[PDB]
Enzyme design. Structure first.
Site, PDB file in Angstrom:
ATOM      1  N   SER A 147     -17.908   3.740  23.173  1.00 28.66           N
ATOM      2  CA  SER A 147     -18.055   2.285  23.205  1.00 28.66           C
ATOM      3  C   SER A 147     -18.254   1.655  21.816  1.00 28.66           C
ATOM      4  O   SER A 147     -18.255   0.421  21.737  1.00 28.66           O
ATOM      5  CB  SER A 147     -19.219   1.894  24.086  1.00 28.66           C
ATOM      6  OG  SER A 147     -18.967   2.221  25.482  1.00 28.66           O
ATOM      7  N   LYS A 186     -15.723  -1.025  20.941  1.00 27.09           N
ATOM      8  CA  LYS A 186     -15.781  -2.401  21.411  1.00 27.09           C
ATOM      9  C   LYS A 186     -15.911  -3.389  20.281  1.00 27.09           C
ATOM     10  O   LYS A 186     -15.498  -4.547  20.429  1.00 27.09           O
ATOM     11  CB  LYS A 186     -16.932  -2.563  22.400  1.00 27.09           C
ATOM     12  CG  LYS A 186     -16.783  -1.752  23.666  1.00 27.09           C
ATOM     13  CD  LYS A 186     -17.877  -1.935  24.635  1.00 27.09           C
ATOM     14  CE  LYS A 186     -17.737  -1.038  25.842  1.00 27.09           C
ATOM     15  NZ  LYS A 186     -18.825  -1.261  26.728  1.00 27.09           N
TER      16      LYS A 186
END
Ligand SMILES: *C(=O)[C@@H](NC(=O)Cc1ccccc1)[C@@H]1N[C@@H](C(=O)O)C(C)(C)S1
Ligand SMILES: CC1(C)S[C@@H]2[C@H](NC(=O)Cc3ccccc3)C(=O)N2[C@H]1C(=O)O
Ligand SMILES: CC1(C)S[C@@H]2[C@H](NC(=O)Cc3ccccc3)C(=O)N2[C@H]1C(=O)O
Length: 256
Positions: free
Chosen positions: A41, A44
């Protein structure tokens, strides 16, 4: 510091990647910094920043409403699930993706942009020849050893995070928005931040995946010194290894 990082890695039973940039003098602390790791992540940041770049030329974009459907929900959607049957704006999706690591929000950003390859093209446009986004969430977190999908190197991501938050990549309002978002992250208490003085100001984005892959990318503002940019990536040989936020805290402490 190098011997410390080596010993940490050895005891940890994994593969550690560190890149520290000290913006006082552009000096660096590098450990496996040219090796690929699954971003999980932490990717992101690039997606959110790509939307911010678009917003430089479209003053209505961040307030654009995006429909949230029950079928959009994936493994972890702490903000988007509050909005099923309703809308969230692109700004709200950027905030959720970054500050809560909402995977539905990430997917909405990717879909808005036209797919993972558009995120990669945005990275290229910033001078990052290393980053690649290949999948949506949550499959971008499989973090299989040797898989190039959804990877970057610690140094490439430190350089790009510096450019995004402190440097050349975004126009000022957009840079500031990204920084605001990162500073307000709620998911990083036990990672890089836990290795730093409590009163240093930090913006960061975490990631976790399979293979115990545990990541954090941060911009750090000491009270009396120029900012530091720190990438700590960690991965392990076994698919169901526990994630290890503490290794990232330890690495941060060592290099600061
Ligand atoms: C990004 O890394 C996302 N990871 C996953 O969805 C897979 C995963 C791995 C371990 C436990 C739960 C889910 C999101 N970002 C991470 C992070 O920021 O550390 C979360 C664990 C919040 S989910
Ligand atoms: C590590 C976990 C305790 S959490 C991970 C997965 N759960 C999710 O993907 C949902 C979720 C994501 C982020 C935060 C909370 C829950 C899931 O299940 N997982 C567990 C596991 O492997 O033991
Ligand atoms: C609680 C959940 C909705 S999320 C958990 C698990 N999903 C993941 O572990 C996500 C993941 C995907 C790829 C790589 C790492 C983690 C998965 O599937 N899970 C669910 C479940 O048990 O019902």
């Amino acid at each position: 510091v190098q011997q410390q990082l080596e010993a940490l890695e050895k005891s940890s039973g994994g593969r550690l990647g560190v890149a520290l940039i000290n913006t006082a003098d552009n000096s660096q602390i590098l450990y496996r910094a040219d090796e690929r790791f699954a971003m999980c992540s932490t990717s992101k940041v690039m997606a959110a920043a790509a939307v911010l770049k678009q917003s430089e030329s479209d003053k209505h974009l961040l307030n654009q409403r995006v429909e949230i459907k029950k079928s959009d929900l994936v493994n972890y959607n702490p903000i988007a699930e509050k909005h099923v049957n309703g809308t969230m704006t692109l700004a709200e999706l950027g905030a959720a993706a970054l500050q809560y690591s909402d995977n539905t929000a990430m997917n909405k950003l990717i879909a808005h942009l036209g797919g993972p390859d558009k995120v990669t093209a945005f990275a290229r446009s910033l001078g990052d020849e290393t980053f690649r986004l290949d999948r949506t969430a949550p499959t971008l977190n499989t973090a299989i050893p040797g898989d190039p999908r959804d990877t970057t190197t610690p140094l490439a991501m430190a350089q790009t995070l510096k450019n995004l938050t402190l440097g050349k990549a975004l126009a000022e309002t957009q840079r500031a928005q990204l920084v605001t978002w990162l500073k307000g992250n709620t998911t990083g208490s036990a990672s890089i931040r836990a290795g730093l003085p409590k009163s240093w100001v930090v913006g960061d984005k975490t990631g976790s995946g399979d293979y115990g892959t545990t990541n954090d990318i941060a911009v750090i503002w000491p009270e009396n010194h120029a900012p530091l940019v720190l990438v700590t990536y960690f991965t392990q040989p076994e698919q169901k290894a526990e994630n290890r936020n503490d290794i990232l805290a330890a690495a941060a402490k060592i290099v600061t």
